[PDB]
Structures are given as C-alpha cells and as structure tokens.
C-alpha cells in the first residue's frame, strides 16, 4: 500500500506500508519522513475527515491502496502531573512533558530519590520503560503512576 | 546561577499559622517546578506539596491537603507553603526544591532548611 499523507499547512509527501498496514505501520513511516513520534500526529481520513482510530486495522477504517489521510502535528509539549511511586511504595507528583525521554524522568526522581539513575528502573502499567523513548509513546496521562523499582544486585 | 532562601520558620502554638517562603534570588523561577519537602525528627524526608512551572497546578500529600497551601508570586520571585491548623505532628525541618523542565537540562537546587516546631 501507498498512501498519501497531506500536512494541513499544505505540503505532501508519500508513505509505504507493506508489513502490518497498520496505524503503527503509518505512524512509523512518518517518524521517518519528518522526524515526529506517533503521539504527536494527529491523522485523519479524507474525504470524511474523521479521526484515525488507534488499534483499528486500516482497511477497517475505510483506508486502501493509494488512499490519502490528514495530518497535523501536535508537539503534545504542555507540562503535566504524573505520579510516581518509589521503591518504597510512597507516591509524588512530577510534572513532564510527554515529549522527554524516560531518561529525563529517570533524572528527576534520581535528584529526588538519592539513588544513582543506572541503579533503579521505572513501569507504567507493568511496562518496563525504555531510557531512549519519550513518555508519549508510553500513553502516560495526567497523575498516571509510574512505578519505581531498585535493581538490586 | 540560582539559590533558593527560605524564610518564615520558627515556633508556633498547635492550632496556629505560619506561611514559609522561598526565594529565587539566583533567576527567577521561570520554568521551574517547585516542591516543599520536610524532615520529621528522626524520619525520612516526605513529600508535602508542588506547584508547578506554569503555576496552575497544586498537589499536597495526604497528610497535608486541606491545611497547607503551596503558592507562587511571580512577580516578586517567591512561592510560599501557608500551614494552618498546625499540629505538633507537623514539627519537622522545612526545605523548598526546584526543578528545571525538559527539554532544558536537568538539574535540582534546594533551599537550606528551616525549622518548625509547633507546640502544645
């Protein structure tokens, strides 16, 4: 499948999917056409125009072969209150955005924890949170709780 | 570069009032979320409240909420902890914390650390 991809501000580039033809397929194809993580798109289907729905198959949401879709980028960037609950079991507020790594976030609680960050690891709905990737593609939300657990050796 | 001063400690009657300061004479606190944490005599140190960068949200721990107020004056570089209804319960040494904000490099600066008791 070719898909066209239509920024709204107006200009248009071109994606491929041939492995799972799915949202993420598309997503990812973006992410390396424009450098914008998947959280940050929002997509629609022309000529509807309603919203692309995540964790639905594309030929089910009316997309084929050579059909185009909408997008506007929302760098979703505007600071937020999680929750993070420490090996402990005791839980504060730490505001973030969803655009920092879970290596920021991992800084944070090190500065406030006492605890070198390479000696302890975090989990948002018992998912091991990877340094590199940003908090977005975790679909964190405001007062989410992320779990602190120590690496001990 | 930043430092963080605390004012507003000192001794008080249960039952009484007391707003704690923390004063960003470095910059300004522009950007920076900002926390009061305590000390509890022989305890580890606890969490109490935060306000944070944009000044438009508030958290307290349970122990606190209802009671305490964590609040900012921007113009004048100051966020203040008002503790009413102080119990001696709430005797601990007092410290304010700031946080920078991604994408800006992290890093944490803390105020020196007052002392309340409350007494009955």
């Known amino acids: 499948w070719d898909l066209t991809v239509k920024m709204l501000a107006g200009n248009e580039f071109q994606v491929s999917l041939s492995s799972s033809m799915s949202v993420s397929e598309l997503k990812a194809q973006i992410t390396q056409k424009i450098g914008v993580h998947a959280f940050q798109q929002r997509l629609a289907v022309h000529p509807s125009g309603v919203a692309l729905q995540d964790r639905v198959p594309l030929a089910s949401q009316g997309l084929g072969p050579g059909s185009t879709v909408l997008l506007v980028v929302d760098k979703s960037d505007e600071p937020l209150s999680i929750l993070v609950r420490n090996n402990k079991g005791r839980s504060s507020t730490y505001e973030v955005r969803l655009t920092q790594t879970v290596a920021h976030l991992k800084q944070q609680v090190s500065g406030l924890e006492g605890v070198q960050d390479d000696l302890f690891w975090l989990t948002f709905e018992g998912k091991p949170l990877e340094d590199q990737l940003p908090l977005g593609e975790y679909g964190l939300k405001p007062l989410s709780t992320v779990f602190m657990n120590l690496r001990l050796r | 570069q930043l430092q963080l001063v605390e004012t507003g400690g000192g001794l008080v009657q249960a039952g009484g009032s007391l707003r704690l300061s923390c004063a960003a004479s470095?910059?300004?606190?522009?950007?920076?979320?900002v926390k009061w944490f305590r000390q509890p005599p022989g305890a580890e140190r606890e969490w109490v409240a935060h306000?944070?960068?944009?000044?438009?949200?508030?958290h307290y721990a349970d122990s606190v909420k209802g009671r305490f107020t964590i609040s900012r004056d921007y113009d004048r570089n100051m966020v203040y902890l008002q503790m009413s209804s102080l119990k001696p319960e709430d005797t601990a040494v007092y410290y304010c914390?700031?946080?920078?904000?991604?994408?800006?490099?992290?890093?944490?600066?803390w105020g020196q650390g007052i002392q309340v008791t409350v007494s009955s």
């Open positions: 914390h700031a946080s920078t904000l991604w994408p800006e490099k992290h890093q944490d600066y």
């Open positions: 470095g910059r300004t606190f522009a950007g920076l979320s």
């Open positions: 306000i944070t960068s944009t000044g438009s949200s508030t």
